[PDB]
């Protein structure tokens, strides 16, 4: 047998074409699945992980932090109108929320 | 017990080389993927039995990342798959 | 800054040259009896099968007498309980359910139940109410399917004496009183370039380039498609295209220099 | 005033693929320049049988197909042969005299000749050799 | 008023016209009106095209203006800003369509 | 211009249905503002529907999937 | 042997069969048990029975004979239970339940 | 062409409940949707079941707890009960 070439890599992926191809077929989205659609769907699974992170890790810079936790997470979900739009009616565990008070409350 | 950790890895230390993340932030991470996985994989069986199709091909997935995400973020989206799917049928 | 719209005159425009059809039914029978005038071995029937006009005629005139694309067109109609089938230029282009011999692109014919009709269109406004010798046209290097195709419609269904296949282009060098030279033949199929040696073709190594006139056509369309973004209120189709080719074209000397200063606004 | 097409590039730009087709519109093939200077300078004097490769072809180059009626499409093409061949070559490109209409006559002054009545293929020809039967003429394709 | 026109559909017929030359034995075969790559495919002439090998002058594919430069979210050659600013705006569905009156789309499968 | 298409009076009977007994004459745009919003969504998803079936024409399941997409369920079509 | 459909051997109106081809068609598993489509038959019976119960007692009262939108949007706004499980839906023709808040009035 | 609908059992059902009573096709239309959507509904909820619990059998169990998640209150005894009929009806023939 010639030697096996992950799909990942044969796409230029880190996120694994193999096992998104397994859920697709194995899990009855439909009869039949193309190669195409576990490819574009890792894809597209990856570039959404790689903004929040980022998002993430620029808000852990911002507090001067090596590490990424959840409260980063959230603050990055939350400040961003995209991905707050995405996850609009989704809960962080430890996440915290975003600082805010009203005008009418601040001192006068 | 199989999770997309690794690949969350992979990622992190490509785009903030330095940068760790923590159990708990993993935890969140990968329920972000299995959810976008979900949803994408769901939107696209219906669109597939709505037009009496019994296939998801790469034209499924693209139609059901424009109808899920937003905006620039649909847009993107759209662009990265397309890239990565000609990057695959060009090998 | 008013001066650049000032003194600009009026402008000089132009309508649409659409290939429409033209209110002429001739049933010539007048060359079946200069025909059957002549001696035998010299009375042949002369189609050229050109992709954009078929053309037929006698060989001891000079213009041909059928010049037809090779469009038909066949109908039922239900308010009228008829079936119809007309055929050549004499489809509009008011109805349209075109198609055509040649396959779009290529001048090779595989769409025998519209050539049948062509040919049959071609006979009978000719005259034929009954056996003359057919010299017909091909392209360069024809597949040999097509040529089975044809021969066996030439025989099989009509009933001919003789038929003999030869290259357009070679026919008209050999009008034009060559000997040995290049013919470059830009067609409406593919661009030809055939080299020939004393009267004889060199088809061992003659070269086609795979544009022509069609391909000018499409390429028109798809630029006055592309230029015209937001949507322009108009029917383009690819023969008003080929209209507007026909004439506003031209092949510039210098490109590089002439193309870079060319929407300069002063001129 | 909307219903109105402008033209200005595509004068120039829809018949210059004949010349440069791998760049305007993608064809990927060579321009007719490069095609000729192919044929008259590395293919011709390379064949056996013939005497002068370029002071025989050179004598005559014409045109003759229905997309050539252009204006200066032959002077275009004398640039380029004239860029190609070796200095001093006689070249003399012309035209043909009635372009669309030639392509018929030239087969109707070959119709009833001899070398037409010896390149025929009758009935009876047909019904024993067979369809693909190639009388083989010098202005058809090879026979097989 | 439409007489007229009812004269000219129905004289300019086939069928009106007894085929008087037409062989009545003969019949049409199904397997017919292929295309060049099933023809091609029957067979295994017509491959005297030749490719090329030179430097080619890369013009701009939004307007015919010569172009040196392309970009990389939609790979268009263009000549200068004001091509750039209707490139990088354009509704969507129509960056694809200047690829494919160019050549070379790659449309997905 | 065809959102003044929905005029100060079909607004007015609007709110009316719902119950609402004054209404300031700022509600009648910013209803309009509302309106438009709520069209493009759902327009946006029913063209995108469209164009995934190769169609041309905007159907009735078109319009019923992109509502129910949106949470906004509609019984009395498809 | 005679034929007996499985709507009727379930003592159902509603049909056994073709609910039993829509779950297997409809991609939703990759196994039907032989229960699933009688069970669900039987359940989507019993609410479409719910609902016309209380449009007929709605069509009744209004002095007519025949369902109209109407009826429908009524008998499913005066039932909490039904309310709650179509809450989010929107019926055409339907109109709303008649209600001025307490403050409004005289 | 070919449409099929729930509008034959809906009217069945009707005859039952209140014989004197028609249905408009409107009303009609609106049945065969809320039919479907259920429909929908309790296959979609007892799908995920199936997977969930990695079995690949939606029986009569993943429908019986479908119904006891997508209905309220009273809905869910009534709904469970006429469904277990059913079944006894059809096992028991
Ligand atoms: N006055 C003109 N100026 C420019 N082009 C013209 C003119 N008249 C005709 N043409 C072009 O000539 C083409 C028709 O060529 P013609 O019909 O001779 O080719 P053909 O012999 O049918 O080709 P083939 O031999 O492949 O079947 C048309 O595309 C048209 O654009």
């Known amino acids: 047998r010639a030697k096996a070439k992950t799909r990942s890599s044969r796409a230029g992926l880190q996120f694994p074409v193999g096992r998104v191809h397994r859920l697709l077929r194995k899990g009855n989205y439909a009869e039949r699945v193309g190669a195409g659609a576990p490819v574009y769907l890792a894809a597209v699974l990856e570039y959404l992980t790689a903004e929040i992170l980022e998002l993430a890790?620029?808000?852990?810079?911002?507090?001067?932090?090596?590490?990424?936790?959840?409260?980063?997470?959230?603050?990055?979900?939350?400040?961003?109108?995209?991905?707050?739009?995405?996850?609009?009616?989704?809960?962080?565990?430890?996440?915290?929320?975003?600082?805010?008070?009203?005008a009418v409350l601040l001192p006068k | 017990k199989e999770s997309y950790s690794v690949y969350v890895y992979k990622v992190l230390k490509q785009v903030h080389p330095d940068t760790g993340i923590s159990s708990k932030a993993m935890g969140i991470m990968n329920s972000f993927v299995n959810d976008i996985?979900?949803?994408?994989?769901?939107?696209?069986?219906?669109?597939?039995?709505?037009?009496?199709?019994?296939?998801?091909?790469?034209?499924?997935?693209?139609?059901?990342?424009?109808?899920?995400?937003?905006?620039?973020?649909?847009?993107?989206?759209?662009?990265?798959?397309?890239?990565?799917?000609?990057?695959?049928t060009s090998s | 800054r008013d001066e650049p719209w000032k003194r600009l005159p009026p402008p000089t425009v132009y309508p649409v040259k659409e290939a429409r059809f033209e209110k002429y039914i001739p049933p010539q029978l007048d060359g079946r009896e200069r025909a059957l005038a002549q001696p035998p071995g010299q009375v042949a029937i002369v189609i050229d099968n050109g992709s954009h006009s078929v053309r037929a005629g006698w060989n001891f005139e000079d213009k041909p007498r059928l010049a037809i694309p090779p469009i038909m067109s066949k109908y039922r109609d239900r308010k009228m309980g008829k079936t119809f089938s007309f055929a050549?230029?004499?489809?509009?282009?008011?109805?349209?359910?075109?198609?055509?011999?040649?396959?779009?692109?290529?001048?090779?014919?595989?769409?025998?139940?519209?050539?049948?009709?062509?040919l049959d269109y071609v006979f009978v406004k000719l005259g034929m109410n009954e056996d003359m010798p057919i010299v017909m046209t091909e392209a360069v290097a024809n597949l040999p399917y097509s040529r089975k195709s044809m021969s066996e419609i030439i025989f099989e269904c009509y009933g001919a004496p003789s038929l003999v296949y030869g290259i357009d282009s070679l026919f008209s060098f050999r009008h034009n009183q060559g000997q040995t030279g290049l013919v470059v033949s830009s067609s409406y199929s593919a661009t030809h370039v055939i080299p020939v040696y004393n009267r004889k073709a060199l088809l061992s190594q003659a070269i086609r380039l795979n544009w022509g006139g069609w391909h000018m056509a499409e390429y028109m369309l798809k630029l006055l498609k592309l230029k015209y973004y937001t949507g322009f209120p108009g029917k383009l189709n690819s023969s008003q295209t080929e209209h507007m080719v026909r004439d506003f074209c031209y092949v510039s000397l210098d490109y590089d220099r002439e193309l870079a200063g060319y929407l300069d606004w002063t001129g | 005033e909307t219903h109105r097409v402008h033209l200005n590039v595509e004068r120039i730009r829809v018949p210059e693929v004949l010349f440069q087709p791998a760049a305007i519109a993608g064809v990927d093939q060579a321009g007719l320049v490069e095609i000729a200077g192919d044929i008259l300078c590395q293919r011709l004097p390379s064949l056996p049988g013939i005497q002068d490769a370029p002071d025989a072809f050179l004598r005559d180059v014409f045109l003759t197909g229905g997309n050539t009626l252009f204006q200066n499409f032959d002077e275009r093409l004398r640039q380029g042969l004239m860029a190609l061949l070796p200095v001093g070559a006689p070249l003399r490109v012309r035209r043909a005299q009635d372009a669309i209409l030639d392509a018929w006559r030239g087969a109707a002054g070959w119709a009833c000749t001899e070398e037409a009545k010896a390149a025929w293929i009758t009935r009876?020809?047909?019904?024993?050799?067979?369809?693909?039967?190639?009388?083989?003429?010098?202005?058809?394709?090879?026979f097989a | 008023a439409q007489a007229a026109h009812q004269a000219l559909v129905e004289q300019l017929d086939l069928h009106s016209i007894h085929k008087t030359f037409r062989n009545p034995n003969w019949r049409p075969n199904q397997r017919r009106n292929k295309t060049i790559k099933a023809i091609l495919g029957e067979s295994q002439t017509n491959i005297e095209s030749a490719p090329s090998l030179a430097p080619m002058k890369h013009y701009?594919?939004?307007?015919?203006?010569?172009?040196?430069?392309?970009?990389?979210?939609?790979?268009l050659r263009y000549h200068n800003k004001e091509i750039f600013a209707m490139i990088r705006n354009l509704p969507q569905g129509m960056g694809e369509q200047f690829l494919e009156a160019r050549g070379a789309h790659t449309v997905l499968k | 211009?065809?959102?003044?298409?929905?005029?100060?009076?079909?607004?007015?009977?609007?709110?009316?249905?719902?119950?609402?007994?004054?209404?300031?004459?700022?509600?009648?745009?910013?209803?309009?503002?509302?309106?438009?919003?709520?069209?493009?969504?759902?327009?946006?998803?029913?063209?995108?529907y469209t164009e995934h079936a190769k169609r041309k024409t905007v159907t009735a399941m078109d319009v019923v999937y992109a509502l129910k997409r949106q949470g906004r369920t509609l019984y009395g079509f498809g």
């Open chain 1, 57 to 102: 890790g620029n808000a852990a810079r911002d507090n001067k932090k090596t590490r990424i936790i959840p409260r980063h997470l959230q603050l990055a979900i939350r400040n961003d109108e995209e991905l707050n739009k995405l996850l609009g009616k989704v809960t962080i565990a430890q996440g915290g929320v975003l600082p805010n008070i009203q």
């Open chain 2, 37 to 88: 996985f979900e949803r994408i994989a769901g939107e696209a069986s219906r669109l597939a039995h709505y037009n009496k199709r019994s296939t998801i091909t790469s034209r499924e997935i693209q139609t059901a990342v424009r109808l899920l995400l937003p905006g620039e973020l649909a847009k993107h989206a759209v662009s990265e798959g397309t890239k990565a799917v000609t990057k695959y």
């Open chain 3, 88 to 118: 050549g230029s004499d489809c509009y282009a008011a109805r349209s359910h075109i198609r055509n011999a040649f396959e779009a692109g290529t001048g090779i014919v595989s769409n025998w139940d519209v050539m049948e009709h062509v």
């Open chain 4, 124 to 142: 009876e020809e047909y019904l024993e050799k067979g369809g693909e039967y190639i009388k083989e003429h010098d202005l058809g394709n090879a």
């Open chain 5, 60 to 75: 701009c594919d939004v307007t015919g203006l010569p172009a040196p430069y392309l970009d990389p979210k939609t790979r």
């Open chain 6, 1 to 48: 211009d065809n959102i003044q298409g929905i005029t100060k009076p079909a607004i007015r009977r609007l709110a009316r249905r719902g119950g609402v007994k004054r209404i300031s004459g700022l509600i009648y745009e910013e209803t309009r503002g509302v309106l438009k919003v709520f069209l493009e969504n759902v327009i946006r998803d029913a063209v995108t």
